[PDB]
DNA sequence: AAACTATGCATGCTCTACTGCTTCTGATCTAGTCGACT
């Protein structure tokens, strides 16, 4: 029962947007700490009858720090390819 | 004089080739991404 299955991507996107918008490092750290605390509290409340489940913050941590992603190889779609694919798919 | 038969013709139908026009498809040239090398 992974926590990421119950956490919408919109919440993470909003947290990242708030972090970027904030000017002082204190506000960014506060936002990230609030998100992490909510995630940890939800994880603790979900896995009550647990057996040392291998569920952690990796699903969100990898997205927050894509540069450290080693499990997944190169996507093969760079900025030019992404722009092209957006053009065909959206039928612009 | 009337009934049956004969030829004769026309037109629509079917097939096979023939030619020319239009559209689809297969072969041939380059941008990007990843990787190799010095």
Curated annotation (Swiss-Prot):
It comes from the Eukaryota. It is found in: Nucleus. Testis, thymus, prostate and heart. Belongs to the ATP-dependent DNA ligase family. It is linked to LIG4 syndrome: Characterized by immunodeficiency and developmental and growth delay. Patients display unusual facial features, microcephaly, growth and/or developmental delay, pancytopenia, and various skin abnormalities. Severe combined immunodeficiency autosomal recessive T-cell-negative/B-cell-negative/NK-cell-positive with sensitivity to ionizing radiation: A form of severe combined immunodeficiency, a genetically and clinically heterogeneous group of rare congenital disorders characterized by impairment of both humoral and cell-mediated immunity, leukopenia, and low or absent antibody levels. Patients present in infancy with recurrent, persistent infections by opportunistic organisms. Interacts with XRCC4; the LIG4-XRCC4 subcomplex has a 1:2 stoichiometry and XRCC4 is required for LIG4 stability. Component of the core long-range non-homologous end joining (NHEJ) complex (also named DNA-PK complex) composed of PRKDC, LIG4, XRCC4, XRCC6/Ku70, XRCC5/Ku86 and NHEJ1/XLF. Additional component of the NHEJ complex includes PAXX. Following autophosphorylation, PRKDC dissociates from DNA, leading to formation of the short-range NHEJ complex, composed of LIG4, XRCC4, XRCC6/Ku70, XRCC5/Ku86 and NHEJ1/XLF. Interacts with DCLRE1C; the interaction is direct. Interacts with APLF. DNA ligase involved in DNA non-homologous end joining (NHEJ); required for double-strand break (DSB) repair and V(D)J recombination. Catalyzes the NHEJ ligation step of the broken DNA during DSB repair by resealing the DNA breaks after the gap filling is completed. Joins single-strand breaks in a double-stranded polydeoxynucleotide in an ATP-dependent reaction. LIG4 is mechanistically flexible: it can ligate nicks as well as compatible DNA overhangs alone, while in the presence of XRCC4, it can ligate ends with 2-nucleotides (nt) microhomology and 1-nt gaps. This is DNA ligase 4. The lineage of its organism: Eukaryota, Metazoa, Chordata, Craniata, Vertebrata. The gene is LIG4. The chain holds residues 8 to 99 of 911 of the full protein.
């Amino acid at each position: 029962q992974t926590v990421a299955s119950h956490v919408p991507f919109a919440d993470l996107c909003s947290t990242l947007e708030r972090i970027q918008k904030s000017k002082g490092r204190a506000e960014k750290i506060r936002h990230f700490r609030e998100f992490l605390d909510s995630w940890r509290k939800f994880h603790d409340a979900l896995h009550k009858n647990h057996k040392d489940v291998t569920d952690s913050f990796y699903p969100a941590m990898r997205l927050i720090l894509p540069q450290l992603e080693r499990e997944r190889m190169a996507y093969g779609i760079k900025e030019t390819m992404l722009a092209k694919l957006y053009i065909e798919l959206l039928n612009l």
